Amino acid sequence: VSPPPPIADEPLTVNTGIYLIECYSLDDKAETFKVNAFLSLSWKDRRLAFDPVRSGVRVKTYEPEAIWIPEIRFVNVENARDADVVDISVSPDGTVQYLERFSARVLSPLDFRRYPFDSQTLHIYLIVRSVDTRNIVLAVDLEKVGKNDDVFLTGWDIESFTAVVKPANFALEDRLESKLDYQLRISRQYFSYIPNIILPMLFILFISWTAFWSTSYEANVTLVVSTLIAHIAAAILVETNLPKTPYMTYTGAIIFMIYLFYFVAVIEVTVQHYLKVESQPARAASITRASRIAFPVVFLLANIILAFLFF
Amino acid sequence: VSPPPPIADEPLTVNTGIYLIECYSLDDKAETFKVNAFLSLSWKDRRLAFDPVRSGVRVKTYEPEAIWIPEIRFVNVENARDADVVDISVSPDGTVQYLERFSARVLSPLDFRRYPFDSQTLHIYLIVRSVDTRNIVLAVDLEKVGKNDDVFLTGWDIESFTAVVKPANFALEDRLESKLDYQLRISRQYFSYIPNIILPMLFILFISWTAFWSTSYEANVTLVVSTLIAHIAAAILVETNLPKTPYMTYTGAIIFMIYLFYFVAVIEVTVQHYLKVESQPARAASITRASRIAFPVVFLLANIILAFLFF
Amino acid sequence: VSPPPPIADEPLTVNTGIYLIECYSLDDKAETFKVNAFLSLSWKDRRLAFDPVRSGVRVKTYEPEAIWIPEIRFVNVENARDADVVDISVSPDGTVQYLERFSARVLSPLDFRRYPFDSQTLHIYLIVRSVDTRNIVLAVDLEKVGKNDDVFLTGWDIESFTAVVKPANFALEDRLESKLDYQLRISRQYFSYIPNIILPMLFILFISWTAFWSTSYEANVTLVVSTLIAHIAAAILVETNLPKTPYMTYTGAIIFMIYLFYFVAVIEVTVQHYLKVESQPARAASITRASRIAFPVVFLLANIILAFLFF
Amino acid sequence: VSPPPPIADEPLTVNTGIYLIECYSLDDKAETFKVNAFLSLSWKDRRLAFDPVRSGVRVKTYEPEAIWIPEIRFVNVENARDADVVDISVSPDGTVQYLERFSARVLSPLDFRRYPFDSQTLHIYLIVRSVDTRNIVLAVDLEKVGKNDDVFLTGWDIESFTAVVKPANFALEDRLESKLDYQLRISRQYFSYIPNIILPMLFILFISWTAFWSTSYEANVTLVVSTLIAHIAAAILVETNLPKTPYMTYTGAIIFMIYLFYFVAVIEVTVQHYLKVESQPARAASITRASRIAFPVVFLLANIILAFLFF
Amino acid sequence: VSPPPPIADEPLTVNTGIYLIECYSLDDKAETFKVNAFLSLSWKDRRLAFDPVRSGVRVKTYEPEAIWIPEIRFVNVENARDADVVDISVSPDGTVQYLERFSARVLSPLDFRRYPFDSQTLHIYLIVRSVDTRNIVLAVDLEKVGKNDDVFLTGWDIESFTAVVKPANFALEDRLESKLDYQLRISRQYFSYIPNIILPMLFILFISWTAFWSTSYEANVTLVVSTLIAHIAAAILVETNLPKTPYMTYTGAIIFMIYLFYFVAVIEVTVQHYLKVESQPARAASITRASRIAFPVVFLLANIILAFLFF
């Protein structure tokens, strides 16, 4: 079966629509998500047109094998989608109405710059390659773009699922290729990050600053070193659930900054002890007393600067 | 093939049933479970009618390809079910009795609010989409809904497997959809959490409170810090076997609360030492003596408050 | 093709056999194992009978598609087996001899009560569903049940592979089902657990008891706490390679008991120090001296009691 | 269908091209990467030639089954490529223009010698085996070799995707094989390694060197031992994300060198204490004072030597 | 299609050959490896013989479906191989020359006794089952057994790939089976284990022995305990990348031995302190002085004994 011939020299408009049934497995490291949805396609094939009076039927149903069907592919998929044709309906004028249900692992990159307070725009790119006979062009039927209310992405809030109505038409290997951009806007559920990593990470840091109320070098060493080991554990746990970014992230910045605070506390603890042994604890006292205000004030201001730069 | 034609204007009732053979792999992080079960379907196709006098047989057998079979799909599956048609039997009136055995990764969300003392209601949604010729409607044959006695879901107790007999009939992309809700009620076996996670977590917390019977700042720092690190390990181990919830969980609350208890013990240990050095151990003694009763009493009451809020 | 018709009203006996080629991947958490084996089936279809003098041939070979073959399934498999028909041979009387080679992920539960000194009975359940024409019943041909000598299950000793000759015949969805139980008896190779997990766990416990020969509260705190953190690592390592059991296991008991020993040592270390500070080291000495005998004696007796209860 | 016959006994030149759609999953340990791309093939089959004036058509489209298609196979793939024929076009002369879209897990080794400041050359090898009728030879059509702008490999910069135009023709099992080398040049984005692994690893090393300003053996033991445990965690974290190389890597060197610095600091801390106890702290002072300059200077020079050897 | 009939009563000799293309993923815990290779088969079928004069052709090419092809299987594979027939050529005398390219997960056990200085012999077993018509026997065509030069097994050196020319002919389920043994000899690249696991493990042990030059019980406890924890981390990192063996391994022995050295050092540290407190440091001094020579000497001799027993 060949593509429907043009009346004049017009391209064949294939109207598309994606209706999300299930959205799942959003992998941050892999920058992938899984989607189970309906794909609807509609085009006019005049060869399939009929008289409802003569045929007695208002709609004719066909098996895929029986008629010409446009080769639609997804651009950003790991492997080609698992599809099951649900229905093919031909109206009397020849307007084919194709519907299939598919599942695909979509590969769409994420911007971790504001993590875990980030929002994302996931993309699903539909594509058709023109044939020799005639050029195929994609269109969006907004009445057939959606998601069911129950669609739930674990750990994310689904804001919108819309399509960019104007396709990106371009040459690829001397043939036209009509590309459509379906956008799924999601925003991260940061609630858990607060009681789970943020607050515990801050408490173990504040526990380290109790060394500013102690003269016991042995206890201070223990305090600042032990908490630094706890911070290493947090920093490992955080970074292992994120991909290696060529840009600095908000969480990355915070984690790095905290390492400097530990390093500078070790230096303070060291200086204080050196002076006490040198029989000059008056200098050590003034240094320690300053640190009690300095460390929190600088930490607080540095965070204000950081949050400001990132948001 | 086309769907069986209506005698009058009635929809085609497809009677369904699911009989669970093996229900396994319930993944808490993924909020998915695997199921291997029988799917039974029964509908009338008068076209298939026969005389057993002429045909010789009292029941006719068919290959799926040979007759019209309703396109039944699962709503909440990762990928389309792996099915194997077990049997297709047509009685003289044209009543079809279809049976297949399938396997599926069902994606049904869990409520972790009372974890590990939570119960769940897993869902398996059956759906049929109406055709142009006639409307298809799902029904439940309760004689064909069940589970074998041996069905075991590791670390869960299977309470019931029932179906919500009245289907959810609704429009979707200008066609009728008949949706059935199969409910598998399970409850978590929390036994292991007690000797494994709970009691060890409580002993290492009580071990830290022995610092209320010591004056050695160096030993107290060691005690409270070391046990804090043990609790960091605990919390990570617990937290990595749960998904990131936008709501606070019972275990999450307990774990968070325990972090405050360590932070407040570090403060007590710090205050006690400061006073000892300040040559006023009478204040330090009274503060420490209070802490011995305070810490357990407050911990016990806080837990009573927490358990109350969550159950 | 319909099933072979009965001479009288007898059921069709399908003789079965499983000959294990490879046994691998016994996952303890998942309570699954992978199997690669031959499945042999034999039944009499008189329609296929021939004269060996007239046909010249002793045996006729058929393609599966050509003749009626009973739909045999495995009950306890994750997904349906990957089979390849090796041979179909028909004798003059009409005795069909079918042979296929298959692979499957069997889901058979384990009893962790005596782990790592446990033995298991893995099950492979064969099942046939009766048809409307006639009832199919399974049988065991013991001459076709076995395993090759080289079958090796890593970290397990294969004792026997036998079949329970009497099938479990029962009604399921108003049709007869004939179920056969194939039992693979294995016993765990516990050797490695001794130099790997057991002895190191016991040494780090005995290391903590050296605090009974020390008066240094700071050194005892260090000793008992450090060894406790090592035990936490041991316990996590052990329990992450086991599923969550609703029953107490031998290893689980030992691990929990050891936790108590650390808690009670912390108490001893605390009491000894309190008394030393209270200027009464005579009581502290007698308490410590007792602990030196008490701790090992109690540990040894508690283990005798435990081993007795579990074996 | 047999291969096209030669006019004069020349080999059949199959012109090839690979246009990368998506690059993903570069696994360093596995030395594998995944690709989704277009594969274009073009050859002359005179049997397929037609008249364009008489036939009215300038191009004829065929189903793969209809014509002879050269068996093109990737050398370095885990399993054979998933492919979907996009189009087959025949020009009047009989020039076939085949296009398929495929996915493959390519196995191309990496050189970890300069990690994480390394660049790589990934390979995709195309191969054709000659037939008895005639020899098939591969060629590169540079106008059909490329990648889309959006191709992104997470944590890697894509430099170029080119082909080595001259095929490696050789005998294999008494038949000619024509092999083509497609090269994808990538370079690691090392940015993240600096705030994440490098700077933290250097700070915990510098923290250990504060023991050169302390006389407290107990505090020095704590300092050097604790920071050493931190380095063990770092080194384990780094080494588990790399394969076992028979050559020394840049990071491997750095990590190993750092272990010696900790061993030599333990020795210094030990010597200093021995002398202090031996009532000769003048020697201990001079040894410690030297170490303060020695340790950083030697560390800095050793790194200059190392970086020089590796780059 | 039936098997070729015998001229006399001779068995049908199927000549085989395996030429390795890519050898990857050798999993130590699983005792498996992946292989991608050519499988060549050749047998005489006189029914296929032809006159090269009357046919004009010197070789006839067939589709698998067209002719009889022996059912060749691999014994030790997880699931049946993924094959693609490359070519089927019939010479005038009727000699079929079949060639396919396949991929398989071969399950061949490893001997970890000398790990990481071990060598292995991986096996690939080819098998054919005899039919009632005639008994099929495998043979090795040494000209068709090999590997390409580029075959690389990450972290292993490929020594040889040979076949044991004499097949193991035996009865299995009342039919003969002809089994061939293909042996791939590999040896582990132990280089990395030295800077990575061995030297760091030895240095953290030597760091513990500095407690023989200290009188500070608190510092010795810290030293011997901290290092013991580092050895636990090592011992896990090692053992988790190895399967549970019923035999003692070289690395297992070394690791176990080192645990005794830590236990005995804790005992020494304990005894030394007890005596110091007992106001008899002359005994403590002589015990400590002995330990300084004893510990390394015994460690060195124990290793010589161990290496001797294992190599």
Ligand SMILES: CC(C)c1cccc(C(C)C)c1O
């Ligand atoms: C589960 C949660 C509270 C948690 C446990 C342990 C450690 C950390 C980091 C913050 C150090 C953490 O996120």
Ligand SMILES: CC(C)c1cccc(C(C)C)c1O
């Ligand atoms: C997760 C479970 C197996 C576990 C093991 C050992 C100790 C703990 C405490 C410290 C939380 C624990 O939670």
Ligand SMILES: CC(C)c1cccc(C(C)C)c1O
């Ligand atoms: C490899 C082996 C000796 C090992 C190392 C570290 C800890 C454990 C036990 C204590 C769980 C262990 O099994």
Ligand SMILES: CC(C)c1cccc(C(C)C)c1O
């Ligand atoms: C360097 C090494 C010790 C390390 C520990 C913990 C966390 C990180 C990053 C996230 C800072 C890290 O790379």
Ligand SMILES: CC(C)c1cccc(C(C)C)c1O
């Ligand atoms: C002691 C040994 C098992 C070990 C510990 C930490 C780091 C490494 C390498 C990466 C140096 C290592 O293999």
Ligand SMILES: [Cl-]
């Ligand atoms: Cl697609």
Ligand SMILES: [Cl-]
């Ligand atoms: Cl489906």
Ligand SMILES: [Cl-]
């Ligand atoms: Cl099955």
Ligand SMILES: [Cl-]
């Ligand atoms: Cl391929």
Ligand SMILES: [Cl-]
């Ligand atoms: Cl096979």
Ligand code: NA
């Ligand atoms: Na079509």
Ligand code: NA
């Ligand atoms: Na059908």
Ligand code: NA
């Ligand atoms: Na300490």
Ligand code: NA
């Ligand atoms: Na059949």
Ligand code: NA
């Ligand atoms: Na073809």
Ligand code: NA
């Ligand atoms: Na084809």
